[PDB]
Amino acid sequence: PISPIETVPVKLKPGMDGPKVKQWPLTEEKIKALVEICTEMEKEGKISKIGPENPYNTPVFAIKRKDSTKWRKLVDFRELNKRTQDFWEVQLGIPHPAGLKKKKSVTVLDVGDAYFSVPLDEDFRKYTAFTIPSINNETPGIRYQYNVLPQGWKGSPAIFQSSMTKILEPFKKQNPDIVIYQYMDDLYVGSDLEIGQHRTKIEELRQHLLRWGLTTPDKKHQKEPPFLWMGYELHPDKWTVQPIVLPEKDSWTVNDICKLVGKLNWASQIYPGIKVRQLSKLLRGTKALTEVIPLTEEAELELAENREILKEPVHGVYYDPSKDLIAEIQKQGQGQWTYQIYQEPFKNLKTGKYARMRGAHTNDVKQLTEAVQKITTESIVIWGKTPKFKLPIQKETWETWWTEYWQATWIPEWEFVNTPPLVKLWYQLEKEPIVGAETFYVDGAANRETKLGKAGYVTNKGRQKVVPLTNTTNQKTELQAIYLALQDSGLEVNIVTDSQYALGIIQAQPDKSESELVNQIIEQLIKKEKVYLAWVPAHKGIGGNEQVDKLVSA
Amino acid sequence: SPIETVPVKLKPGMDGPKVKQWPLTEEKIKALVEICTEMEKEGKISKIGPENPYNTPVFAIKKKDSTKWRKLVDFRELNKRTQDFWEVQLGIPHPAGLKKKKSVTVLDVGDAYFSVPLDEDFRKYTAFTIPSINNETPGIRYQYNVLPQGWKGSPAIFQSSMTKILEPFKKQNPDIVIYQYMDDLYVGSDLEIGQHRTKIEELRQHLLRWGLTTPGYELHPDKWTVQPIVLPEKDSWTVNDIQKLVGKLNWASQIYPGIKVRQLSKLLRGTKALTEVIPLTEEAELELAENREILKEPVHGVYYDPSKDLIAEIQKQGQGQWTYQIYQEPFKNLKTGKYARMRGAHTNDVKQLTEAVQKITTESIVIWGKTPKFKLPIQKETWETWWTEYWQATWIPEWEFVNTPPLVKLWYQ
DNA sequence: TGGTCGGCGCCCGAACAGGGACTG
DNA sequence: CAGTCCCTGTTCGGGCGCCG
């Protein structure tokens, strides 16, 4: 029914009044059910009629539920919400089946008319005023107001979760050895008791709840393995996600692509190797989520490959705190990666991906660490632990990069897993001039307001060159220039520069960039067996400098 | 019940802290929870709900193989919002007498602020939330009734009382300087460790039978120089070998408007082979030893203006090689130095970087009565991921992250 | 016909920000 | 100094998925 728990105090944003919008028309169907609900709600006390004295009103409606003769009465409190104070959302994320430890007994209860069991503070009620239209379009609609957490109000969620804990508090406190994963009104009760003794504790809990205004009707999973919880299927020794169907269609619109990626992203927690880069990339041109978009080959494929993975059935295991937590990552190409966290080989708890391209000039070791990060954070969130890693990168390639990178980078305890593709720096830079090597003095520039500009070089053995760039810029030149000094040189070269924009990009050993020019500068760098790049201050007349600028300054 | 909970207000038109709690470890939450449990059973904290829209992150950290967890709250975002309450109305006079102290000793006393009922109308700001492993339960919240450790006002409102608690031992040992920052209390003297340490042991017996309770640890930041910006010492110079000392001294010039260029710039006016050897003339060869003198002669343009915030820059060199650039103005380095890994087991990049933020900050306080605004050389996600692991200062400097190539490390290297 | 709320994930664009390079 | 450029990071919001 309705609970004696202490009502939570609620104020309105300084100097604001309640909502006063009218009830935009509703079908003769919805009305039939709203008045069917309200009668029950009013009779029960969850709401009360109100007269002229109440100067507020908000529009309401209803929805149907999955396989339910049941409707969901909602209220369009969009207006009130703005005018309502703001709260501190107490829900910090979501539980993951792969974090549950194996239990001897599991139960799942679901509180009934959840929100409608928790009272709304006496003084705020005035605003929750709404009106139920008449279908014969005559009688002035009936007006009521809430006396319990209304569905669709900005605050009810936080209040319900809050009260719920407060309600469970004593039970929890007196039955410390019993786990109770609560998410809104859904309760998963775990125990290491025998059927008998656990089923008794599951009863005491239920009663306590009822006694505290909370009903646990038979929607209560018992010898229900597989239990339905949080969108999974919880079996005695494995769990899996529920049927996750993708849409098979002819022509794709944008929101279609949104839905696809959405679900696929969701399946990537258990189905290993789902990838979406190409399918998503297909959504850069901001447009109507009704605008039909043409699929690219590189996407048509990854769609079908994915669509395939989703066919073999898969599942995941539960957590064993007495064992180590392992996570291994593999390179899926073009920035993408896939990983799985297991404890016993082949029996992984979870899987996941990483495809964020942080930066414009980075390599695969930068990304590989970007991932080890995500996987720690995440792994802490679920297990409150940090994994031991298995990585496709030489125990050396690493001691190379970090011991040579200007930034402090780190990786937790880890070991090498020779399971190519392997990760490696596609080339190095001599950090000491190369004897007998045409030393090139390179530079270039371009005019601010005009179109073009240019860049070129000169040698120490007598050689001169320059190229007329177009629409370039102060930077697009230094690079465009160091580009020639590569092809126009051989296995061993020594380029010199006064720009930092280019020495910086290149010193990071980047092997992937957004700009086509950069990529060419790398490609070449891989072919050479020795390259050195030193820097010297621009416009300070240094031996070899001025000549180059001149050839270009024009 | 005549207590005296001083009222406090936030700067003009400034809402309170509304920052999200970040992931912790089983070990940290089990502690953070065993703590709050106690803290509440003594009304220092009170469970609170969703209706309170303010929040601050919190966690714990171990200390000195004492295996004693200690809560900690990142009040940074509050201290920035808690009005000049601690600045324009209740400042702290620079006790520069510390810089010189032969042997200083840091001691955390804040474990006492918990005896000073905090203004109720303000408590509502001290809101913080503990989370759950794998998210089994919603966030359990709380509030402060007494004074929150690691808060700006917290040490202020209390110093009035502190001072008086000190007159006995503080008037009987005027030689010693006593400073208070945040939760910590610094005691600078000149006696040798043999007796100087035995004296701090007395400050204790004074403070414990007066309420307070506090469970090498010493310092002498002055008894360690700013390491100068050194140059090479060769007897054969290559083309780049020179072009380096040049470009280096080129920028190392802004820190000394007087530093010679041409004599060493003349040595090359054409496209020369980097490998090529080209020793110097006696003038430029005299410059190397001249411009070389200006690098033992402390810079000139430094004035500690308390009116602005101490920024800081840091560099990662090689094998535990980190460098300091504490300055308030560009090139106007008020103080620099370095930090290397000790003859103990080798740690990693971040573990050090952090220690090399605490040390630089500890000094910063003793030398200026405040903390910097570190420009960091690490990637946010990386920093924000492990930092809390290797920390132990009961305070937290503000900071930002910057990715900038070196060769500009040549100068401190 | 459609229309509500809170949490978290992903991805994209937009809006900032801050440096270094020039120019007035 | 401004007044701009480039360039690169970061934050915020929106759309979708999943949960109640």
Ligand SMILES: C[C@H](Cn1cnc2c(N)ncnc21)OCP(=O)(O)OP(=O)(O)OP(=O)(O)O
């Ligand atoms: C109100 C709460 C959260 N919730 C669930 N769905 C919604 C929604 N569409 N809008 C707002 N809140 C929503 O629903 C819990 P729920 O279990 O979905 O429904 P109920 O009211 O508890 O009734 P029953 O037990 O018979 O299933």
Ligand SMILES: [Mg+2]
């Ligand atoms: Mg329910």
Ligand SMILES: [Mg+2]
């Ligand atoms: Mg140039």
